Each structure stands twice: as structure tokens, then as C-alpha cells.
Design a binder for this molecule. Structure first.
Ligand SMILES: CC(=O)N[C@H]1[C@H](O[C@H]2[C@@H](O)[C@@H](CO)O[C@@H](O[C@H]3[C@H](O)[C@@H](O)[C@H](O)O[C@@H]3CO)[C@@H]2O)O[C@H](CO)[C@@H](O)[C@@H]1O[C@@H]1O[C@H](CO)[C@H](O)[C@H](O)[C@H]1O
Ligand code: NA
Ligand code: NA
Ligand SMILES: [Zn+2]
Ligand SMILES: [Zn+2]
Length: 401
């Protein structure tokens, strides 16, 4: 057996914002109960896309943590780079605590590499009061009706959509992906087609909005995005469900009591489905000496539903129902928004991510930015994604048909 005290490290990229139950306060509850398995949790200091790059460096140097947050979209990539540890025999014991979909997303070739933590269905946030002032009395359900409403809003200096060039690889991929995968293994080779009917419909929607100067073009993570919420100009947008508390904080309180969550309309060729934008597992890394206890702790951590919800997560756990915090329902006009998140999750399309998708997302963002001043077309996001996807697979030494 192990010695009396096993020490585990967990690196995460949860927000830990004001109002949230901090990861360290969650882990402190574990540590008090379990002197036998002590956990040191740290938040990655850096932007999200740099985390798996640090993990790569640290695995090689022998400085890696036992446990690390790894997006579902990132897992095939870090697996292919040899950064993970097969923990199938441990995952199997905790399987029943988690939804089957998310659980399948910690697997590669029927081997499990950690446990699922949250999901990222796309939804629509809007200020119902401001919609009413503009005469928009229903969420438009077709792209054409939405675009018409958006032009009405824009003429009034309001915007019912944002175009987020720094999120094209996550949000726009998810919107296009709602109606069909881009990546499939066909035996000895990958087959790539990022130019699906969904990609085309998604491009057309944003193109018409941008041409009409009827969507904001501020990068999501820039202060200019927050300012557009605070100043009342951005009154509607697609958002990943985990954005809720982030968006609330970014608003400064503007529109509190008037915001609502709706399912995505049929704006993206999505035909009643939504798609994933982020969502993460926590994986056990290659040279962790204590995979059993890492997974023991992880199962506990990933089933602390209310605490995870406080971080904005839509938990993968099925051990208890997630409930909308009182502060959130108050901001969102009394709405039980978690119910909308659950509906969205249940209507979210499956989407395989090729190993190396980080390069695809990088290219998507670069090309997306060209569309903001009309130097590029929105459709080029997807034609470039096609080429970068094929190139990246080949760079990994993988066969492409
Ligand atoms: C899918 C994901 O991990 N989303 C993150 C989100 O990540 C994007 C942002 O960091 C933007 C900032 O510009 O960068 C994007 O990466 C780009 C990068 O900007 C380019 O320079 C480079 O060339 O390409 C990359 C793409 O490879 C990131 O993708 O960041 C937000 C805010 O920090 C995160 O919240 C979000 O992750 C989700 O966080 C939730 C907690 O708030 C949950 O953990 C959820 O599961 C995560 O998916
Ligand atoms: Na073949
Ligand atoms: Na291009
Ligand atoms: Zn114990
Ligand atoms: Zn051990």
C-alpha cells in the first residue's frame, strides 16, 4: 500500500471570480476529511489556450500536476502527444456518477483518461425589456426573420448579436457543428470536411449581420465587450452556458432583472439542435504516481454540484440536480436558467474533435478577425479550417483520406 499521506496536485482553469465558491475552498473540505489524500489545487496563471502548452512542457520536465483540466476538444490532442495516463480501471468505478455522453468524451479507443466535469451547450442571452422597446415580441426563429430584427435594432444603435472573432474556434465551430461533425475516422485514415451545410448556413448568418453592421465585433475577452453590455448597446448574443456568471459580472449589473436565456433559434442550419462550445474533463497526466487517489478525489470534486454551478459550470455529474443560484435567477428576471441549460445540453449535437484542433481553432480566429472590417469573408473561416485540419493531422503523422 501507499504511505499514510498521498499528495495530489490539481491544476485547473476555473474562473474563481467574486461571488463564486473558490476551488480552494471546495478542496479544503476534502483535505479536512482526508489527511490520507492531500490535494493542492492551483489556478493556471495564463490564458486558456496556453494551459495545454504548459502541461506539455511540464510533463516533459517532470513538473506536471497529477490532475489537470483538459477540454473535451483538447483531449485527443494531449492524448496524441502522450501526456495522459490510462485510468480505465478507476474511471469504471465512477462511471455511474456521470452522464453517459460526457463520460464517453474522456475515452480514446475505449480507454479512459480522467473524468468529465462540465458541458458547454450554446444558448441565447437577451434583454427582454430592450427587445420589447424595439417591438421584437418573440425570439425570431428563422435566420431571415432574425436578420430583419437585427437590422431594426442596429438602426436604433442596439445589437441583438455579437460576432466574437477571438471565439470563432470554439463558438463558431460549435454552431456549425450542431448539425453535423467535421471529423471522422474511416479505418486507416481521417476524413475531414469543415464545409458542411451547417458551416455554410453559419457563415451566411454572420456574413449578413456583418454586412448590415448589425452585430458587435468586439473580441469577447476584451474590455470593449464588457463595455457594450454595461452601456446597454449589446442586448442579445449567443453564449456558452458556462458564461452566465461571467456575463453577469461583465454587465456591472446593467439590465439586471430583464435578461433571459432562450434556446438557439434555427439560425445556423442547426435544425433544432445546439452544439458544444468548450466543456471540460479533468485528466490524469502521464507520470502521476497516484492515479487511484487522484481519481478518488476527482470523483468527489466533480460531484460537488452546487459548488461547481457557482463557477458557472453545467455539471456532467448526475448525482443530484443542478439548481439555479438565487443571484442568477434575480439577474435573469426570475428565470430558472439552469433548466434552459439542461434542455440545451439534451439537444446538443455530438462532435468529434481531431487531434490538433488547437491549430484549427487558432486559424479560425485569425481568419474570423479578417471579416470584421470586410477584408475577409465569414465563409473563409471554414475553408481555412479545412486546410489547417488536414495539414495538422499530417503534421501529427496521421493519415488523411
Ligand atoms: C474552449 C475553451 O477552452 N474556452 C475557454 C476560453 O478560451 C479562449 C480564450 O482564452 C481566447 C482569448 O483570446 O483565446 C482562445 O484561444 C485562442 C487564442 O486567443 C489565440 O491567440 C490562438 O492563436 O488560438 C487559440 C485557440 O487555439 C481560447 O480558446 O477562455 C475562457 C475565458 O478564460 C474560458 O472560460 C473558456 O473555457 C471554459 O471555461 C469554463 C469556466 O469558466 C469551463 O471550464 C469550460 O469547460 C471551459 O471550456
Ligand atoms: Na482508407
Ligand atoms: Na483564408
Ligand atoms: Zn480519507
Ligand atoms: Zn497511490
Amino acid at each position: 500500500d501507499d504511505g499514510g499521506v498521498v499528495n495530489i496536485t490539481y491544476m485547473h482553469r476555473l474562473p474563481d471570480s467574486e461571488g463564486m465558491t473558490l476551488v480552494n475552498d471546495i478542496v479544503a473540505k476534502w483535505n479536512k476529511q482526508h489527511p490520507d489524500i492531500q490535494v493542492k489545487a492551483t489556478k493556471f496563471d495564463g490564458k486558456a489556450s496556453d494551459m495545454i502548452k504548459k502541461l506539455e512542457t511540464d510533463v516533459k520536465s517532470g513538473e506536471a500536476p497529477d490532475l489537470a483540466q483538459v477540454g473535451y476538444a483538447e483531449l485527443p490532442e494531449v492524448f496524441t502527444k502522450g501526456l495522459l495516463q490510462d485510468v480505465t480501471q478507476y474511471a469504471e468505478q465512477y462511471k455511474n456518477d456521470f452522464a453517459s455522453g460526457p463520460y464517453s468524451l474522456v475515452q480514446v479507443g475505449g480507454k479512459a483518461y480522467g473524468l468529465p466535469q462540465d458541458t458547454g451547450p450554446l444558448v441565447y442571452f437577451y434583454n427582454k425589456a430592450e427587445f420589447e422597446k424595439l417591438g421584437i415580441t418573440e425570439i425570431p426563429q428563422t435566420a431571415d426573420e432574425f436578420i430583419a430584427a437585427a437590422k431594426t435594432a442596429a438602426a436604433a444603435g442596439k445589437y441583438i448579436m455579437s460576432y466574437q472573432p477571438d471565439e470563432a474556434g470554439n463558438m463558431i465551430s460549435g454552431l456549425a457543428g450542431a448539425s453535423g461533425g467535421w471529423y471522422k475516422v474511416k479505418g486507416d485514415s481521417w476524413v475531414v470536411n469543415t464545409e458542411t451545410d451547417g458551416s455554410k448556413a453559419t457563415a451566411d448568418f454572420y456574413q449578413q449581420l456583418l454586412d448590415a453592421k448589425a452585430a458587435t465585433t468586439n473580441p469577447r475577452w476584451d474590455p470593449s465587450f464588457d463595455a457594450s453590455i454595461k452601456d446597454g448597446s449589446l442586448i442579445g448574443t449567443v453564449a456558452a452556458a458556462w458564461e452566465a456568471p461571467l456575463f453577469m459580472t461583465s454587465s456591472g449589473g446593467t439590465g439586471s432583472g430583464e435578461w433571459q436565456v432562450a434556446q438557439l433559434g434555427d439560425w445556423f442550419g442547426n435544425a433544432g439542435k445546439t452544439g458544444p462550445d468548450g466543456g471540460s474533463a479533468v485528466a490524469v497526466l502521464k507520470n502521476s504516481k497516484h492515479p487511484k487517489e487522484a481519481m478518488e478525489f476527482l470523483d468527489w470534486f466533480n460531484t460537488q454540484v452546487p459548488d461547481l454551478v457557482s463557477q458557472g459550470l453545467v455539471p456532467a455529474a448526475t448525482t443530484e440536480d443542478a439548481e439555479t443560484p438565487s443571484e442568477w435567477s434575480t439577474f435573469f428576471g426570475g428565470q430558472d436558467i439552469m433548466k434552459e441549460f439542461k434542455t440545451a445540453n439534451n439537444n446538443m449535437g455530438d462532435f468529434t474533435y481531431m487531434p490538433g484542433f488547437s491549430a484549427v481553432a487558432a486559424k479560425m480566429n485569425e481568419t474570423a478577425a479578417k471579416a470584421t472590417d470586410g477584408s475577409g469573408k465569414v465563409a473563409d473561416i471554414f475553408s481555412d479550417a479545412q486546410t489547417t485540419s488536414v495539414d495538422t493531422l499530417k503534421n501529427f503523422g496521421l493519415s488523411v483520406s
